[PDB]
Design a protein around this ligand. Structure first.
Ligand SMILES: [Mg+2]
Ligand SMILES: [Mg+2]
Lengths: 163, 163
DNA sequence: CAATCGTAGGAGACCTTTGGTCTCCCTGCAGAT
DNA sequence: ATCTGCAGGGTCTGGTTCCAGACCTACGATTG
């Protein structure tokens, strides 16, 4: 049936797969906010809830979400932001009636044979373009790898196979 | 005029103040989760949303929430968990129809004259007991300071004053 | 169960398989074209 | 604007133009 895949971080996206084969992918809504006298991007909570409420996916649809797992060498702001983005998305999905299933990036990458790639973000856009050819135009920029990763997480959840 | 005050961390609480002067305070629901082969406490998303849905406070009620601000010397896990709990609560409150207003701890502490105390958690329980005497029995343990801080945040938002 | 103390910390999936091995980002800021 | 590269970082309020002063939290463990 329906499958949702969420790539939750600031350059992420939510992909929605319908039973008739169609797909949608939306960039994560964000806002600019002032923190410690500089500008930071933060997810836009109201817009995410509005987006989820507008989906045709019925209550109980599984929403796969990529599990938050920053490196010990990443900065503490990286740790805070990945936690924040994860919590915001999990509560939004639960409140909107979806069944949240966290998935490690290694899981869907291994499924599509994408591990240890020299060009992982390019490879993600290529794989997503082949699985979802009507999204090829929406994946033409390097910055679209977040869209590709959400689509691939959803594709994993739906059991799709590359040709 | 209803007022909600949320102390969002793992030992926190949500306080609800009604226009008739009554109050409720609920410990934050949590679950035990496995992470890196050890047990960690994490907020319980479903129980938080269920709790919010059961409140009598009408949509549009303001929910003051204590702003997340860990120290630079706190560990990266502390940074992740304060971010996660903050995001989970913000999305839960917005999805439940409440108007979220972040408040720094310094703001409500200064308002009640609590800064630079030798016993800050005891003083919070004492101040909350004086503002909400029918919660005195619910504030008598040292571990109840999370409840006290949620009540004081709500009291700040309502404009209450100590005698 | 409740209180207290002290430092500030990866996490996850699958193999080699009851421990071992290998994998994975993310943010924040500056720069160039 | 899009991309690229590199290191891994506090933040907030009241008082102004930056300063001064203030604030936790988590994750372990132990003791009764
Ligand atoms: Mg991502
Ligand atoms: Mg707190």
């Amino acid at each position: 049936g329906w499958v949702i895949g969420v790539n939750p971080d600031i350059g992420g996206a939510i992909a929605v797969l319908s039973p008739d084969g169609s797909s949608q992918v939306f960039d994560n809504p964000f806002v600019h906010i002032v923190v410690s006298e500089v500008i930071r991007k933060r997810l836009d909570t109201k817009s995410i809830i509005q987006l989820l409420r507008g989906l045709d996916a019925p209550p109980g649809t599984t929403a796969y979400i990529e599990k938050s797992s920053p490196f010990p060498t990443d900065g503490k702001q990286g740790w805070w932001s990945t936690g924040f983005s994860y919590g915001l998305w999990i509560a939004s999905l639960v409140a909107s009636g979806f069944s949240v299933v966290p998935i490690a990036s290694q899981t869907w990458k291994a499924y599509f044979g994408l591990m240890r790639s020299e060009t992982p973000k390019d490879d993600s856009r290529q794989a997503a373009s082949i699985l979802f050819p009507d999204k090829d135009q929406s994946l033409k920029l390097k910055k679209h790898h977040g869209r590709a990763e959400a689509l691939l997480l959803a594709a994993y959840g739906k059991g799709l196979v590359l040709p």
